[PDB]
Structure formats: C-alpha cells, structure tokens
Design a protein around this ligand. Structure first.
Ligand SMILES: Nc1ncnc2c1ncn2[C@@H]1O[C@H](COP(=O)(O)OP(=O)(O)O)[C@@H](O)[C@H]1O
Ligand SMILES: Nc1ncnc2c1ncn2[C@@H]1O[C@H](COP(=O)(O)OP(=O)(O)O)[C@@H](O)[C@H]1O
Ligand code: VO4
Ligand code: VO4
Lengths: 614, 614
C-alpha cells in the first residue's frame, strides 16, 4: 500500500546558439522505471539534469510538476536523489561501513544510532548485498566486492534517506548483462515501495524491459519515441520500418536512428511522427500531505545539514582514520622516504666541523633537509584528489560542510606529520651535530613539523586546482624547486634581482631554511674562524704555523685591532650576515611557516567554493 | 569449403601443493566456439594457457593434440594466436593504422605492401569495423572508438596472420550486452573460414549461446560440465537440481556452483557426475599437409621475426613519430618546463659578476640547471610504461626484437632532446653571461644534450623496474635528488665520507655539473679576486681603498710575493681546485654523461630479457 505520486513534465526546452532539449513530455507514476534512452551526445544526461533541477533556473522553459506544488528546488533535496555516473567509493571501507557513514551524514541527528543501523541493514537486504555486507569495496589492487555490487553500494549511498523520487545517470554502465539486470531488479524493488525512478540507459537487455514501464528516446533533444516498451513494435511499423522477431526491439530502434540523421535527410521525419503516435493513444489531497502520508507508511527517513559542524568533523575524522589504518603502505612509503633521506643526510653530513667549508655544508644540509619536508608531502597528491572526487559527490546532498571537510583533513594528517617530524629530527640532529642542545632540538622538531604542515597544505591547495595526478605532481615538483631556488640558498636575498624579490618572500622553503640557520648559527661560543683560519684557504699565506701571526699583527697597522692566534673573527652571527639571514627571528620564521599552512588551507577552502559553482 | 582441424585435449593436470587443473578433457573441431566458463579464481585462464603452451613443459601432464602431430610449441607460433585480457592499444593511431602496423610487423616481408593492405582491408570487413576504420582508438580523453570496437581491434591485431587456432582470454569482459554479442558474432565469422576458437567467458548472454557450440565449466580445476549448451538443461535435472524456463541456463548453472562448494559438502559430488554424463552420450591426411591445405584455400598469411632488425626499426620509429605528432601536448609540457625554468634561471642569475659570491651563484646556477635536464626527463615516465605494456603484448608474437625496441626508442626521443637542449642553452648562456664565447656555447649545448640523453635513459631504465607510475615518479624524484646531493655541489668530493664515495661517482648529475664548471672556470683571463678582494668580505680590513695596499704589501713579509692592487689572486682554475673539480676534463665528463646514457639503455634491454622470463 504505497502513496501515489505522479511526476509529470510537460514541455522542456534548454538552450545553451545550440539547443539541447526541445519539448520533451513525460508522465511517470510511482512504481515505474521510466528510462531515457539515446546516444553518446544526445543529451539524456541533460534531461534528467532538468528534472532534478540541476541546471540554471530560468534557462529551462517549462514545468516539471509532481502531483501538486510545482516541484521547485526545495522539495528536491528531501524527497529526491540524483545518482551520478561512477563508483566513487573509498576502497578500504566495508559495504556496511560505507552505508553507515552515509547514514551518519544525512539521516537526522534526532534518530538514534540503533535506528540508523536499522536503516542500513534494511537497505543491504533491499539492494541484495547481504553476502558482501562485510567485504570491503576495493580498488584494482585490494580484492574487494565486484563491479556490479560496487554499483548498488553507489546507489545505496544516495538512497540512505529513502527518497520517493530517484534519478540515476546510467546505473548500468560498465556492467555485464547479468549484473545490469540485478541493478534494475533492485531498482524495481525500490520502485514498489513508492519511489519514482527515472534513469538513463544506453542499451538495455531484453530482461530489463519488463521492469521498465516507460521509455523515452532522444535524438539531440527532440523526443522521437515516448511510451511503453510493448508499444515499441507497433510504433516503427507505422513509421515505415517494421522490426523482425527474435531480435531485441530497443537494439533495432537505436541503430536505426544513428543512420537516420544522414546528411540530406535528418531525424525531423521521426520527431514529428512521435507526436503523431501520442495523440492517437489518448482515446482509451495536497502534495505536502501526500509526502507526510509516505512517512506514515515509512518512505522518508530525513535543516541544510543534518549534523552540527563538530559532529560531522568526528565522522570525517573516523573515515580518514579507517581509510588509512587499513591502507598502511601509504604511511610506509612516506615514512621510509624521510627515514631514508634522514639516514642519507645524517651520514653524508656526519658531524660537520667548524671549517669555512663545513659552514657551506650546513647551508647545504639545511636546504636539502627542509626541502624533504615539502617533497615528501607531494606524495599524498594521489590520495588528495581521490578524497575530493568523493567530496564533490557528497557535497551535492549536503552530507557535510566544506569547512568540516577542510578542518577534519587538516586534523587527521597531523599525527602522521608529528611522527614524520620526530623520525627526521632524531636521525639528523645528533648525527649531523647540530647546535642548540635540547632546546635547539625541540625547535628543530617544531620547524620540521611546521614544514610538513606548510607542505601538506600546499599540496592540498594544489589539488583543487589541478585535474590530473600526473599534471599536478609535475607542477608541484617544479614549483617546490622554485621555492628552493628562492629560499636564499642558491642565491642570497640581497643578490636576487628586484624584479624577482617577491617570489623569494613567497617561497615556502625560505622560512624553514632561515629558521634553522639561526637555530644553528646563533651561539656566541661557537666559532668558525679562530684567528688562524683567515689565511688557510686564502690565495696566500700557506705557512706551517709560523709567520702567520706576523701577518695577523700586520693587520693591526691599518685598524688597531689586536688579532691573536685565536681571536674568533667569525661567529655564527657573522655567518647569518653573510647569507642575509637577518630580517626575521627564528620564531617569526616559524610563524610564517605555520601561517603559510593556514593560508593554503583557506585557499583550498576557497577553491572548493568556486568548484561548487561549476 | 574449409579444412577440418580437430583440437583434442584428453587429460590435463597442472600442479603449482596446489593443483590448478585436474583431468580436463575436450574435443573441438573447426567452426566451433568452445567456451571455458568458471569463477574468479577457478583457473579458466590457466586451461587456455595450457592449450596455448604458455606454461612450463613437463609440468603439464597430458596431451594437447591436433589432428596429427601432437601440437608442441613449434606449430603454436604460425597457426595460433592468444588474445590476452585488455585493450593495450596506442590511442593516437587509427584503426586502419593499428592493423597495418601489425601487418608490417608479423606478415612476412615477401608479401608486398599492397597484399598487406589487402589483408587489413579484408580484416576490417570481417571484424565489422568499417565505419570506424579511420577513427582513432582514443584513451579516456581523446574521443576515439567505442569500448567494444576497441576489442575487435585488439582481437584483429592478434589475427592479422589469420590463425587456424585462436585462443582468447575473456574477449567479452567489460563490454555491455549488445557489444559482447558483436564480439562473438565476428568470432563466429572467424570460426566459419576454418578457425578453432577457444575462449574464456564469465557470464554469457542468451544470444551468445547458439554461437558457442561447446561449453566447459570449471571449479578450481575439476571440470563439472563439458558439453553442448543444449544438453545443459538435461544435465542438472539428472544431477538433482532442475532448472526453470524463462531463465538464462548458464546463469543458473553458475550461481549454483558458487553456493555448492560449501564447508562440509563440496563440489566433489558435481565433479564425479560430469564423467557420468560423458560416458552415456557416446552411444550415438597428415597435419602438415592439412596446414598446407589451409594456405591453398588461404587461411594462413604467415623465421623467428618476419623483418630484419633495420626494417622493424623504421616501423617502430614510424609508430612513435605518429603517436607523438598526434599527441603534441607531451612535448608542449616538457618544452614549457625547460623554457619556464630557462627563463627563471636566466633572469635570477642575470649577468653574474666576478664576485666571490657571484662564483657560488654560478655553482648554484649550474647545479639547478643540470638538474632540470634530469627532472624534465622524468615527466616521460607515463608514456614509457604505456609503450612497454604494449611491447609485452607484441613480444609474445615476435612482432619485433627487444633490441629493435630499445634502439628505436632511443632514436625517436633524440630530435626531441636536441630541441630541448637548444631551448635551454640559448635562454641561459647569453643571459647568465657564461664564459666560453661560441666554442663554450657549443659545448654548453652538448652537455645539456648529453644530460637529456643520460636522464631519458635513466627514466627509461626506471620503467622496467617499477610497476606503477606513482611509485616510479616518487622513486625517480627521490633518486635524482640524491644524484644532486652527491654531484659535488652540496658537499664536495674531498669532503664526502669514505663510506659514501661510490654514489658520488655513480651520480648522474655530477659529470654534467663538473663539465660546465670547467667550461666556465677555465680561462686564464677571467679573474675573481683582483688583489683588493682579499679583505672585501673578510672579517677585517674594511677600509675605503687606502691602507689595504699596506696590508697587501705586508703579505711580502712572510711570502716574498709582491701582491699589488690588481694581481689576480684567484683565476677560474683556483675555483675548480676549491670545489675539487680536478679529476676529469670537461670532454671526459661529457663522455661519462653519454656513457651513462648508453649504460641505462643496455640495463633497460637487460630488464626486458628478465621481464620476458616472467
Ligand atoms: N555538466 C555539463 N556542463 C556543460 N556542458 C554539458 C554538461 N553535460 C553535458 N554537457 C553538454 O551537453 C551536450 C549534450 O550532451 P548530453 O545530453 O549530456 O549527453 P548524454 O546523453 O551522452 O549524457 C554535449 O555537447 C555536452 O558537451
Ligand atoms: N600467470 C600466472 N602466474 C602465476 N600464477 C598465476 C598466473 N595466472 C594465474 N595464476 C594463479 O592461478 C590460480 C588460478 O587462477 P586462474 O585459473 O588464473 O583464474 P581465472 O579463471 O580467474 O582466470 C590463481 O591462484 C592465480 O593466482
Ligand atoms: O555523452 V552521454 O555518454 O553522458 O550518453
Ligand atoms: O581470476 V580469473 O578473472 O582471470 O576469472
């Protein structure tokens, strides 16, 4: 005993000149699986984008009406669901967990978790995925569910709130003949409890034609057949091309059209025959209370967001913990890239002396060290697009906010970055022989952690801007190399030209590099030229030890300073003056590294706003 | 009027303990499309790997026999074809071009090109791809042929020599119901001219069961049904589970097995019933001259390789030219990465002076310049795996040699690297103000070209070793950073520790870097300390210009040399002695850069030998 809903769309015209829809009529009751057949550019993903109100208002001339209140974009978020054309699921999540996260995101917080689990277990029985309810989804290399049980979990995510109107953009694409029948057979099970189901389909099997109660064929818009599948034999015989038996009728009715548009003819002879056939077959409670009559039976489980910003920030945290705990070779390869570089940098630069050449090796250690923190954060660019192609699916239903997505993904990566910062610091502080003691080691861990934080935020920012993972990881390798060229190591700040001293201050490597130099070269006790080391690698004065002091006493002719055999002519403060590291403190250079991390998480949030407009 | 061939395999047992095949019997005449049905781990890609002789000899107990001479792995290279399970095609090639390259690779050179084009045009009519014969194949973003016309080109490549025995590993996987019927319908057209076709199939449609004349069901080996599809209703009724009508017969016979293996029961009740059914149904010219009788009709178009090493080196050249000419945004992104870095490096290091700090900026220019040649060659790692996943397909047929593949792919990239070497050299020689004149510019182009050649060969070598494009481009970014740390720029050769002075000499960046330093700092006229530059950035001697000459005359107290106000205390030969660039000439450092390129193309060739063993 369902509640009857009648989705009637009378005339549709969408022009982008180039028209895409032209006077498509339709009428679909509950219990029916109206199918929109067509071509690969016919615009059948545009027709159901116009019934789901997913195009601009005012650019769609005509009415899409339910039984009652005109069906504008206020009811088509509580009672509607639009299933897109992919299976964008997290692969380390089981089928019961994937539908329970969608239940915790979109079902209201007034429901208990025992009632949200009762919705998931009733949905797993409905989709026919009870045998794979505890099997993970799986990508190409993790041995999960099949390709046609990955579609009913994709369908099951969008119907977790139990809609009474269901749009699907090609739910049988990519599947074989025996599992595309299983998808429409559970859509028939959905559309017998009261749902209106409107789907696109390229080439249906003969088994899925007694499930579909209505068909619509499109030809660059321009509906050429619109009726029951049983009336499809007695439509083209009147047109001029009768169909033979022992042949799929929708197969013959589709390849006939793709040779009929011609060059001198056209589909116009077939368009005007469609309105001929619809004219001759006619000789044969409010909406808001009908929606509430569905909830009395129970046909609608579900404010803009069902959860507060602090509830959906612990659910997105629990997803990202579970998706990385079950995928541990991601922080096994990023961990053994900072340990391998940490072991290499510690043994090459092992216990650097206070020579003038051992000072330039500190500048070369700290430039290679602080660039590892930015290059190992670029390895996470594969699983940053994968988490935001699923985010763009779940933003259409308002499962969570964009603020709760950016904040909960800055949170889950941070215990990973604390472990990467201690692994790189205990390998390279005591082995390179860095200065500071223990309070210089704690700052060394803090500036590695801020460089992991500023580097993860930049690669996160460079994932709302790049489409591809190979274009993005070529661009981020090139840009971080320019951040290293402008860090002040290859060319100093007072030597960079004036048309280029703006990307020096925009360098992400500069402020970690300038903070470890004055963590290391800030000590009045350590010395790098002890009086005799003036004339050591000079172009003169290659003496044994004698008569160098007479050269040092000869310096007192011109200045008056009494230079002895050990007088400490170069401290660490003179190294920083040679390199130009004088403008900011090491704590101010730590704030800019933390501040550049917060900047690129805000700019990532602003690129999710403009990506929502697309 | 075909020539009858009867492929009879009587008993097969393959053990890897873990038995994978157990006593599979079969008998397939010409004109029949024997199908091997099963599960997702049943080992039905192992049964046709044992009929194609693609497993180890002696590990397969039993006979796979044709009508005659026992069918060992000498006839299964001329008369056989094994179609694997993918569509590994170059996407910028048209359908007529993709089959003409396979005709130029595998048809004998005794045939004219007019007879090889007559084979391709007869094959395009046979596969039913005449409408898409001049359409390109296309990847996900280049708008090519469909997914089920990409399979008949994949099938059409392997049957270009017109085999009389055809094995296919799942030729209907990934397709929909209407194009998997089109694949078996052209296989029915192939297997009416005289071919024996043996294919694996997961779930066949009801239309493809009157084309298949024989079926074999497997259950972890262990053939459970082996007969005609019409005898499939009258097999399970005798077993104990009769099938209802209006139901696909192979659909019910497959999900019955996946619930029958149980935990306390097993498929053993179904295995021993298969030999029951085969016993009760039986109550109802040499091979070498039968093969030559097929060529009399014309059923075999096709030495180990059909072409010499110089003919298939111009065909692989013509493929790689056509695949890159029609994909020009590959050398549009690698070109605008050496021009953008070339413009950045030329304007930052614009006209470097002869200061002591402008010397260290030359070492920083040349380290960043010579590392661009290795990092921009790592962008080609996507299309290096794609060209060698297609190479592993075409090595199984001996379409070309491994030597002709390595040599023709070192050849086609070289005019691309000459243009990248002139684009980086004319941007950065005259703008940075490098020394040498015009004979120092020609060496500058040669060492950029050798660094592009040594860097392309290393990334080519690191594509037979890595499976994945993201693992490989993380590894090659990390290793080339270690080639740069050991180049002698970050730490000099005489300062690198003795447990690490073997990766310094294995550094790929070291020899380009050491060759441009003694192309630049090898001039007895240029000078970097002109007498007064002793005490200009010293910790003392900060005079105006006066009384420094008394300090310089004071050097003659202990040395005896008359140091004047302009005496050239540091030439370019003293810069190279400070950096340790003394062991090799710039022409010897150019030979090691060219020699490291030839080393990594030999090691790439040796990794294709060991990849053939897998
Ligand atoms: N989201 C979109 N934004 C912009 N243009 C679109 C969008 N979707 C489709 N189009 C365009 O609309 C036209 C009609 O195609 P469409 O009806 O979407 O095809 P199909 O029936 O294959 O799904 C195409 O030219 C396509 O480029
Ligand atoms: N080329 C191969 N090398 C090694 N093991 C293989 C190979 N192909 C299959 N196997 C193994 O053989 C077993 C049987 O699977 P198989 O018969 O290939 O399956 P399917 O019927 O799905 O093609 C599996 O455990 C698989 O790991
Ligand atoms: O171009 V459409 O594939 O979405 O049929
Ligand atoms: O594991 V097998 O897919 O090759 O059916």
């Amino acid at each position: 005993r369902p509640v009857p809903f009648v989705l009637s769309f009378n005339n549709l015209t969408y022009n982008v000149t180039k028209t895409l829809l032209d006077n498509i009529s339709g009428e679909t009751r509950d219990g029916e699986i109206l199918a929109v057949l067509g071509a690969s550019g016919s615009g059948k993903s545009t027709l159901i984008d116009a019934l789901a109100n997913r195009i601009a208002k005012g650019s769609l001339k005509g009415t899409v009406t339910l039984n009652g209140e005109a069906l504008q974009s206020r009811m088509l978020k509580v009672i509607s669901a639009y299933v897109m054309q992919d299976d964008l699921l997290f692969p380390m999540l089981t089928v019961e967990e994937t539908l329970m996260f969608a239940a915790e995101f979109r079902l209201p917080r007034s429901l208990p978790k025992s009632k949200k689990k009762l919705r998931v277990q009733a949905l797993i029985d409905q989709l026919g995925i009870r045998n794979a309810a505890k099997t993970i989804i799986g990508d190409e290399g993790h041995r999960g569910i099949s390709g046609g049980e990955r579609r009913r979990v994709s369908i099951g995510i969008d119907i977790i709130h139990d809609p009474i109107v269901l749009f699907l953009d090609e739910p049988t694409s990519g599947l074989d003949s025996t599992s595309a029948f299983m998808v429409v057979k559970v859509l028939k099970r959905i559309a017998e409890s009261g749902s209106i189901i409107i789907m696109s389909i390229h080439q249906p099997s003969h088994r899925v034609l007694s499930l579909l109660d209505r068909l619509i064929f499109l030809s660059r818009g321009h509906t050429v057949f619109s009726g029951s599948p049983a009336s499809l034999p007695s439509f083209f015989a009147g047109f001029g091309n009768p169909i033979p038996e022992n042949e799929n009728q929708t197969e013959f009715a589709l390849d006939l059209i793709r040779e009929l548009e011609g060059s001198a003819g056209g589909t116009r002879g077939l368009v005007e025959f469609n309105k001929k056939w619809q004219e001759m077959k006619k000789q044969s409670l409010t909406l808001k209370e009908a929606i509430s009559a569905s909830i009395s039976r129970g046909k609608l489980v579900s404010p803009a967001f069902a959860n507060p910003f602090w509830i959906e920030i612990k659910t997105l945290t629990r997803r990202s913990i579970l998706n990385s705990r079950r995928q541990p070779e991601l922080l096994g390869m990023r961990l053994a890239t900072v340990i391998v570089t940490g072991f290499i940098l510690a043994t090459v630069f092992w216990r650097l002396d206070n020579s003038p050449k051992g000072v330039q090796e500190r500048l070369g250690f700290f430039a290679f060290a602080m660039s590892t923190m930015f290059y190992t954060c670029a390895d996470a660019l594969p699983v940053f697009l994968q988490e935001r192609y699923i985010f763009m699916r779940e933003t259409a239903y308002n499962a969570y906010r964009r603020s709760s997505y950016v904040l909960s993904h800055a949170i889950v990566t941070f215990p990973s970055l604390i472990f990467l910062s201690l692994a790189f610091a205990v390998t390279t502080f005591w082995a390179v022989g860095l200065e500071g003691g223990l309070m210089g080691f704690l700052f060394y861990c803090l500036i590695i952690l801020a460089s992991f934080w500023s580097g993860s935020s930049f690669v996160t920012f460079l994932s709302g801007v790049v489409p591809h993972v190979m274009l993005g990881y070529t661009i981020v390798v090139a840009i971080l190399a320019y951040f290293l060229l402008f860090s002040g190591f290859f060319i100093n700040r007072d030597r960079i030209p004036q048309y280029w001293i703006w990307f020096h201050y925009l360098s992400l490597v500069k402020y970690p590099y300038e903070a470890v130099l004055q963590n290391e070269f800030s000590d009045p006790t350590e010395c790098f030229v002890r009086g005799v080391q003036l004339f050591d690698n000079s172009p003169l004065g290659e003496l044994t030890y004698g008569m160098k002091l007479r050269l040092l006493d000869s310096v007192s002719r011109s200045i008056g300073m009494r230079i002895s055999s050990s007088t400490c002519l170069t401290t660490g403060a003179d190294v920083l003056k040679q390199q130009g590291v004088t403008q900011l403190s090491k704590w101010n250079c730590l704030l800019i590294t933390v501040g550049f991390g917060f900047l690129f998480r805000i700019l990532f949030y602003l690129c999710l706003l403009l990506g929502s407009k697309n």
